Design a binder for this molecule. Structure first.
Ligand code: CO
Ligand code: CO
Ligand code: CO
Ligand code: CO
Lengths: 167, 167
């Protein structure tokens, strides 16, 4: 069970955090996680390349579709919707969507879900990390909601696997 | 090996066509394909719900990632990019992107790939089917490229599994 990751990209960060999620929330053994220039995962007979094939293999192996997807709120539709837009946007956020991210979070603890962190939160967390990390205090106060939420994800999902340093 | 599908939606059409693709291009047994109001696939021990979990299970079982994704042209990046935008757009095409679809196809046989039909072509084929099916001849001539390409996909990938009637 070895998962190999890149080290400059948010696709790897997502995968590390999902694992932290799997342990934080769900739960047997866990992947090795070595480093390389490209993303891969080999399990038993099979082999998987890229984030998405990798992601689904991971979710499949840990049975954790419902928890990451808010199946129990029928917000599955909405989770892959959010995470599909983002991976096609190449994980970049424009001010306009930063603003609307910040509105969602005024009145919700999590981006899609009511109850708990889902796959949408893990995706947006690693995407905003650097555009939030490299930031001035005066500006955040515009996105104080994204800020409050970022810290809640950081102090609750982050564990051994994630290497991103605390803000 | 039973795959159960919806019947009013393009998510099912995509899955049927992928199977037709698997036989047309790749290639052992094949799924039963019964009908219901929701998408599902059960294989051996495991069970899968929705199009994407279903899709990846299918691709995983038939080993056909490279062929659907143009791995051999390193256009994997670009394939999931195209198909992620579309599934988040809820499989609807605006005139502006219809127009740009139609430009791609003036000078390319397939949407992303040079060589062969990929996962992007299967996705856009089922999405444009009805906005193309319910159409006037005068208008198509604007999208004559999308039209030429639609017929090429229809006469080459379509097989037993797809139920959409010929245009
Ligand atoms: Co829940
Ligand atoms: Co966008
Ligand atoms: Co090829
Ligand atoms: Co769009």
């Amino acid at each position: 069970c070895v998962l190999t990751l890149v080290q400059d990209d948010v696709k790897s960060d997502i995968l590390k955090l999902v694992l932290d999620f799997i342990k934080a929330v769900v739960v047997v053994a866990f992947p090795e996680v070595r480093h390389e220039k490209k993303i891969s995962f080999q399990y038993k007979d099979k082999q998987y390349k890229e984030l998405f094939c990798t992601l689904y293999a991971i979710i499949d192996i840990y049975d954790c579709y419902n928890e990451l997807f808010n199946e129990d709120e029928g917000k599955v539709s909405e989770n892959e919707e959010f995470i599909f837009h983002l991976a096609s946007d190449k994980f970049k956020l424009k001010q306009l969507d930063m603003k609307h991210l910040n509105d969602l979070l005024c009145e919700k603890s999590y981006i899609v879900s009511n109850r708990h962190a889902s796959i949408v939160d893990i995706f947006y967390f690693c995407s905003v990390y650097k555009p939030l990390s490299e930031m001035p205090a005066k500006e955040r106060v515009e996105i104080s909601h994204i800020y409050r939420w970022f810290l809640h994800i950081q102090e609750t999902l982050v564990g051994k696997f994630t290497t991103l340093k605390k803000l």
